[PDB]
């Protein structure tokens, strides 16, 4: 209404400066409740990661982040949920908070309002199930697809739809680069107001990640979460 399908994409960030989606995805952005960036005017970054399936390395992820006490706001699918609620009780108990990824990860804007509220409640109803606990509303459409009419429908539902200004080639388990890769991404994409997109499933992931944090540190960026991106932009 319109329902036409658009990828979330961009061109990369270039000179640690925020990649731009262009004015018409900046207008659609700001149109309905959603974003690509936090607060560009600081040294600030936000980790994201998606979760779809387990492949032994979210364990140490958790290890990582509270290593160096940063919080992370992992989107999980239904099938992430059932199969893994104890990965899901620790990101909880851990102080990270956990965002919609859809149930069945389906495309959303090929499903009608009342499929999109249950794909996205029941991942909520099964997430209480497990933690007596419910964050803020924040949703990722499956493969960055999405819509004016899927933004304005899950605006509707009371969900703040979370895009992403870094991700790379880090879901690929038939290829999987290893730790510096994964590492030389992290630093090279890096600017002020970045949100992260980033999967737990490739081999060093954590690693990868535990350095990137550390020397990210040493330059004098910030890890702040989804809910403080929210809350200070707000003031």
């Given at each position: 209404?319109?329902?036409?399908?658009?990828?979330?994409?961009?061109?990369?960030?270039?000179?640690?400066?925020?990649?731009?989606?262009?004015?018409?995805?900046?207008?659609?952005?700001?149109?309905?409740?959603?974003?690509?960036?936090?607060?560009?005017?600081?040294?600030?970054?936000?980790?994201?990661?998606?979760?779809?399936?387990?492949n032994?390395?979210?364990?140490?992820?958790?290890?990582?982040?509270?290593?160096?006490?940063?919080?992370?706001?992992?989107?999980?699918?239904?099938?992430?949920?059932?199969?893994?609620?104890?990965?899901?009780?620790?990101?909880?108990?851990?102080?990270?908070?956990?965002?919609?990824?859809?149930?069945?990860?389906?495309?959303?804007?090929?499903?009608?309002?009342?499929?999109?509220?249950?794909?996205?409640?029941?991942?909520?109803?099964?997430?209480?199930?497990?933690?007596?606990?419910?964050?803020?509303?924040?949703?990722?459409?499956?493969?960055?697809?999405?819509?004016?009419?899927?933004?304005?429908?899950?605006?509707?539902?009371?969900?703040?739809?979370?895009?992403?200004?870094?991700?790379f080639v880090d879901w690929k388990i038939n290829n999987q680069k290893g730790?510096?890769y994964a590492?030389?991404?992290?630093?090279?994409?890096?600017?002020?107001?970045?949100?992260?997109?980033?999967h737990?499933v490739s081999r060093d992931n954590?690693?990868?990640?535990?350095?990137?944090?550390?020397?990210?540190?040493?330059?004098?960026?910030?890890?702040?979460?989804?809910?403080?991106?929210?809350?200070?932009?707000?003031?």
């Amino acid at each position: 209404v319109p329902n036409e399908p658009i990828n979330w994409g961009f061109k990369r960030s270039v000179n640690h400066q925020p990649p731009d989606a262009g004015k018409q995805l900046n207008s659609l952005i700001e149109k309905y409740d959603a974003f690509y960036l936090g607060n560009t005017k600081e040294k600030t970054i936000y980790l994201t990661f998606d979760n779809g399936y387990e492949n032994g390395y979210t364990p140490k992820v958790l290890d990582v982040l509270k290593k160096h006490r940063v919080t992370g706001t992992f989107f999980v699918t239904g099938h992430f949920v059932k199969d893994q609620p104890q990965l899901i009780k620790r990101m909880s108990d851990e102080g990270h908070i956990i965002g919609n990824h859809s149930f069945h990860h389906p495309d959303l804007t090929t499903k009608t309002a009342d499929q999109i509220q249950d794909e996205l409640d029941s991942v909520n109803e099964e997430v209480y199930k497990i933690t007596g606990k419910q964050d803020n509303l924040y949703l990722r459409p499956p493969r960055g697809v999405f819509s004016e009419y899927v933004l304005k429908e899950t605006k509707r539902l009371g969900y703040q739809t979370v895009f992403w200004s870094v991700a790379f080639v880090d879901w690929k388990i038939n290829n999987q680069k290893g730790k510096k890769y994964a590492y030389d991404h992290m630093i090279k994409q890096a600017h002020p107001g970045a949100i992260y997109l980033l999967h737990t499933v490739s081999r060093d992931n954590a690693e990868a990640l535990d350095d990137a944090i550390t020397d990210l540190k040493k330059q004098g960026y910030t890890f702040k979460s989804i809910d403080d991106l929210m809350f200070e932009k707000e003031m």
